[PDB]
Amino acid sequence: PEVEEWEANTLQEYEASISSQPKKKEANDAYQKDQLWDQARIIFMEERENYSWFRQLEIDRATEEQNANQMLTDILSFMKSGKR
Amino acid sequence: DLTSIQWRMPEWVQSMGGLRTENVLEYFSQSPFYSHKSNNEMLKMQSQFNALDLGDLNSQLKRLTGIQFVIIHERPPFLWVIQKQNRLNENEVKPLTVYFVCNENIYMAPNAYTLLATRMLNATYCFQKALTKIEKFPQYNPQEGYTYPKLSNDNLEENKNQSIENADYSFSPEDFSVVRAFMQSLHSSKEAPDV
Amino acid sequence: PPSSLQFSRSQPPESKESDATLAKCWKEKSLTSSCKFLFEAKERLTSVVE
Amino acid sequence: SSDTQQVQNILELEAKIPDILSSAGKCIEAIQLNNSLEDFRKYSKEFLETVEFISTGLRRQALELEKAEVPVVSLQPKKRYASTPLSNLIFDQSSKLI
């Protein structure tokens, strides 16, 4: 009953709009406007793809650490022996 | 309006000695739902004139196309199903809206989609109300989470786990503590002599 | 025991034209609620930035 | 770009975010109050950059957070015992008492 009450609360004000605007129906225009939603959504979808959306060198930093590690093996071998 | 609304004339049904077969159709004649365009109406006229020119029901109805209210089913002495229909041929007929005697009462048979969508309406409405009541209430702050401003605190006593280990000496709220335990220990103790 | 219900092929049946007006009236109010919602949220978030 | 400065750069990013709301509500308004598909094409064309520039700005600032190589966990302080300024400070008071 509260729902239909709200429905009467909607119809009373739509008919109030009819009072303020007697012979000015726009649902027919609202059809092509819905078509405007239909176009606007498609353009909206296609437009987003145009924009950019998301570095191996940082991976290579690990190779730097790697050679640094082997270099550590080298220097420890040096302290062990003096070998170069 | 001509849907779920109740109707009854109990004194009539009590007057009839109980519904039988034709008399229950007469009860349908009692009903607002009854149509003047119904084949039963012109057949009633035929009874008023030709009288003898009658043959049970369906033998009389099926050969006479138009609005009808055949008793496809019944549940004596309670329910009595009465399907409306529209005859076209000796075979062809369009099924139409059910009417029935819901114990000296008549209700049109609801459409499935109308009431499923009705309940869907009720539910989604409860959902709208569910959202609108709590909108503008989670007083958000990135610094402080989803605050809910209140007249007073307790009442009851993301991965941001990081902090300094030992901390001490330090400070960290401890906005409140044990104060709830004051009074609650007091009331747990007030019942102690009772225990 | 169930199976109380049974099939009944009888009309769509029909719908009032005012319901079509409701289809518009609900949606327009919803859209207005949408704009007010986004604007209000921008306001309180602006204060949060403050 | 050092220390606090990037944070200040983040401050530049801060103003943009809330507006993204009303702008969207502006876009719809073009098909709503303005009833105009074209103006909607306009503000919808504007609206997406608020998303893209902020998103990329975050990903890049975070990338800077990695390049700076600031450690993931806050360090536990030692009980610092004698930074010099504390020392000559206390000494300063010592002369102040003398």
Q: In chain D, what residues touch A36 (CB-CB under 8 Å)?
A: 31, 37
Which residues make Cβ contacts (< 8 Å) with residue D1, sequence separation at least 6? D9, D64
Beta strand spans in B55-154 (E): 67-70, 81-87, 93-101, 106-108, 139-141, 145-147
Residue of B nearest to C47 (CA): B141
Distance CA B140, CA B192 (A): 44
Q: Does residue B57 sit in helix, strand or coil?
A: coil
Contacts with D77 from chain B: Cβ below 8 Å: 164
Residues 6+ apart with CB under 8 A from B67: B35, B37, B38, B39, B84, B85, B86
Measured CA to CA, the distance from residue B153 to residue B161 in angstroms comes to 24
Q: Which of D74, D79, D80 to substitute to test the interface with B, most B CBs within 10 Å? A: D74
Local structure of B172: helix, strand or coil: coil
| Residues D34, D41: Cα–Cα separation, whole Å | 12
B164 contact residues in D (CB cutoff 8 A): 74, 76-77
Alpha carbon distance, N-terminus to C-terminus of chain A: 93
Nearest to D30 by CA among D44, D19, D17: D44
Q: Which amino acid is at C45?
A: L
Residues B84 and C9: beta-carbon distance below 8 Å: no
- Residue B110: how many CB atoms within 10 A of its CB? 15
Cβ neighbours of residue D20 under 8 Å, at least 6 residues apart? Answer: D47, D50, D51, D54
Contacts made by residues D45-53, CB under 8 angstroms, sequence distance 24+: D45/A47, D47/D20, D47/D23, D48/A47, D48/A48, D48/A51, D49/A51, D50/D16, D50/D19, D50/D20, D50/D23, D51/D20, D52/A51, D52/A52, D52/A53, D53/D16
Nearest-angstrom CA–CA distance, B95 and B85: 5
Method by which this entry was solved: cryo-EM
* B192 sits in which H/E element: none
Cα–Cα distance measured from residue B109 to residue A15, given in angstroms and rounded to the nearest whole number? 32
* Three-class DSSP category at B145: strand
Q: What 3-state DSSP class applies to B146?
A: strand
What is the rounded distance in angstroms from the CA atom of residue B77 to the CA atom of residue B177? 71
Please choose, from the candidates B68, B66, B100, the residue with its C-alpha nearest in 3D space to the C-alpha of residue B82.
B100
Residue D45: what residue type?
K
CA B114 to CA B117: how far, in whole Å?
5
Contact in structure between B101 and B77 (CB atoms under 8 Å): no
Tell me the CB-side half-sphere exposure of residue D25, using CA atoms within 13 A. 19
Nearest to B7 by CA among B81, B117, B103, B119: B103
Contact flag D59-A43 (C-beta cutoff 8 Å): no
Which of D29, A63, B55 lies closest to C34, judged by CA?
A: D29
CA distance B35 to B28: 9
- Chain D contacts of C30, Cβ < 8 Å? none
User: Which chains have 3 or more CB–CB distances shorter than 8 Å to chain A?
Assistant: B, C, D
HSE-CB at B154 with a 13 A cutoff on CA atoms is 13
The structure was resolved to a resolution in Å of 4.4
Q: How far apart are CA B143 and CA B145, in angstroms?
A: 6
Residue ranges of C 1-40 with Cβ closer than 8 A to chain A = 18, 20-22, 24-26, 29
Identify the DSSP state of D68.
Answer: T
Q: Does D73 touch chain B (CB under 8 A)?
A: yes
Report the alpha-carbon distance of residue B57 to residue B41 in Å, rounded: 13
CA distance A46 to chain C (A): 23
Closest CA to D51 of D11, D13, D25: D13
> Could you give the CA distance from residue B22 to residue C37 in angstroms, rounded to a whole number?
63
Q: Where are the alpha helices (DSSP H) in D1-98?
A: 4-14, 16-32, 37-67, 84-96
The span from the CA of D7 to the CA of C50, in Å, is 16
Contact D32, C32 (CB under 8 A): yes
Task: Give the CB-side neighbour count of residue B131, counting CA atoms within 13 A.
Answer: 8
Q: State the first-to-last Cα distance of chain C, in angstroms, to the nearest integer.
A: 66
Distance CA A22, CA C3 (A): 52
Residue B108 burial (CB count, 10 A): 16
Closest CA to D50 of D27, D7, D19, D25: D19
Find out whether D29 and C38 touch, Cβ atoms under 8 Å: no
Q: Residue D35 contacts by C-beta under 8 Å, 6 or more apart in sequence?
A: A33
- Give B-chain residues touching C11 at CB under 8 angstroms: 96-97
CA distances from D66 to B107, D13, D70 (A): 73, 19, 7
Query: What is the C-alpha separation between D50 and D20, in angstroms, rounded?
Result: 7
Distance CA C4, CA B172 (A): 66
Q: How far apart are the first and last CA of chain B?
A: 64
- CA–CA separation, B5 vs B105, rounded Å? 10
Is the CB of residue A10 less than 8 Å from the CB of residue C26? yes
Contact indicator for B95, B67 with CB cutoff of 8 Å: no
Radius of gyration of chain B (CA): 36
Omega before residue B193 within 30° of 0, cis: no
The answer to whether the Cβ–Cβ distance between A11 and C24 falls below 8 Å is: no
Is B80 exposed, middle or buried (CB count within 10 Å of its CB: 0-12, 13-18, 19+)? buried
